[PDB]
Amino acid sequence: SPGIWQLDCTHLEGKVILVAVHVASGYIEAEVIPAETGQETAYFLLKLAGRWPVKTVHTDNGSNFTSTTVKAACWWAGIKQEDGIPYNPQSQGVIESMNKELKKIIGQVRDQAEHLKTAVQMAVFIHNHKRKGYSAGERIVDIIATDIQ
Amino acid sequence: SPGIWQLDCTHLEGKVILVAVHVASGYIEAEVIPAETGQETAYFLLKLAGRWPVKTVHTDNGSNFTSTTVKAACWWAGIKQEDGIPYNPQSQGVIESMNKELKKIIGQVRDQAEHLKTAVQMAVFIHNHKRKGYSAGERIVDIIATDIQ
Ligand SMILES: C=CCN(Cc1ccccc1C(=O)NCc1ccc(OC)cc1)Cc1ccc2c(c1C(=O)O)OCO2
Ligand SMILES: C=CCN(Cc1ccccc1C(=O)NCc1ccc(OC)cc1)Cc1ccc2c(c1C(=O)O)OCO2
């Protein structure tokens, strides 16, 4: 549970937003890329796993599950690469709701920057700091500190 | 002290590596950019502060301390922007030693990727996971969790 993350790919403005969600907390990291390739996804996972103790990633589609570059990054970074089959049907819903919330936030900040990447990092910040009372950023730290102890 | 970070700029292969270090733990985030500008530094701090509870940043030089774009991102993200004067002379040495360790790690992985940005993210991963016993990634989570509690 503390080490499990889910990849999610959404689209805006003709670009791709790649998201990793820490499933137990709802905390996210995200980036804009011009298209989802195995190299971009592999690089994104390398970044994530240098920052948080990523044990397992549920990939966002079969092409990223198949990609030998993504499998190579997961090998390098010590991550168990898994499929993203929603054996719990509530998973599809949680991810659709997250993309809709993120896109809502991006539209709320969109005029505050020229480049979509800037708006998406403002949206990561607001999402992670939003009190629901704890924020997603507080929950991930507590979950992982509990695991370390 | 759980919220205090230090910016650091180092050079390799004709490029710039921008580093944020969490002072109490030694944990780092880093990125490669073609040159250190106010916009690149402001974007980097926006990313950092959406991922960790960044209260204070000691900027790496007077150009980033002065930059109105850097000041605007620190306003947006709720960061107190401070200068980086090493009132403790041990601060100079610690940053120099970190740059030398990071460049050593980059040389140890350099032939495992074409692009320097890849090598630098491998080096962030190795640095954050190295036990010296706890790793910097463990120390930062424990420090912030203690603080939330
Ligand atoms: C001279 C700055 C260029 N713009 C000006 C702009 C252009 C259009 C609308 C608003 C603005 C505006 O000032 N908003 C406030 C602001 C300030 C700093 C800030 O720092 C994170 C983010 C936002 C902001 C910007 C900075 C760094 C970036 C960007 C962009 C971008 O516009 O996307 O892209 C990647 O790094
Ligand atoms: C598949 C083509 C790309 N190369 C091949 C390569 C070129 C030269 C030397 C070694 C290799 C090699 O296979 N090493 C192992 C490896 C695999 C996956 C991995 O994923 C993080 C990092 C490393 C690795 C790469 C992937 C993603 C990127 C990169 C680069 C890069 O070379 O820098 O740049 C930004 O995203």
From TrEMBL, chains A, B:
It is a lipid-anchor. One of its GO terms (molecular function) is DNA binding. GO terms for biological process: DNA integration; DNA recombination; establishment of integrated proviral latency; proteolysis; symbiont entry into host cell; symbiont-mediated suppression of host gene expression; viral genome integration into host DNA; viral penetration into host nucleus. Residues 1-144 form the Integrase catalytic domain. Its cofactor is Mg(2+). It is found in: Host cell membrane; Host cytoplasm; Host nucleus; Virion. It catalyses: 3'-end directed exonucleolytic cleavage of viral RNA-DNA hybrid; Endohydrolysis of RNA in RNA/DNA hybrids. Three different cleavage modes: 1. sequence-specific internal cleavage of RNA. Human immunodeficiency virus type 1 and Moloney murine leukemia virus enzymes prefer to cleave the RNA strand one nucleotide away from the RNA-DNA junction. 2. RNA 5'-end directed cleavage 13-19 nucleotides from the RNA end. 3. DNA 3'-end directed cleavage 15-20 nucleotides away from the primer terminus. GO terms for cellular component: host cell; host cell cytoplasm; host cell nucleus; host cell plasma membrane; viral nucleocapsid. Coiled coil: none annotated. Keywords: Aspartyl protease, Capsid protein, DNA integration, DNA recombination, DNA-binding, DNA-directed DNA polymerase, Endonuclease, Eukaryotic host gene expression shutoff by virus, Eukaryotic host translation shutoff by virus, Host cell membrane, Host cytoplasm, Host gene expression shutoff by virus, Host membrane, Host nucleus, Host-virus interaction, Hydrolase, Lipid-binding, Lipoprotein, Magnesium, Membrane, Metal-binding, Multifunctional enzyme, Myristate, Nuclease, Nucleotidyltransferase, Phosphoprotein, Protease, Repeat, RNA-binding, RNA-directed DNA polymerase, Transferase, Viral genome integration, Viral nucleoprotein, Viral penetration into host nucleus, Viral release from host cell, Virion, Virion maturation, Virus entry into host cell, Zinc, Zinc-finger. Its main location: host cell. This is Gag-Pol polyprotein. It comes from Human immunodeficiency virus type 1. The lineage of its organism: Viruses, Riboviria, Pararnavirae, Artverviricota, Revtraviricetes. The chain holds residues 57 to 209 of 288 of the full protein.
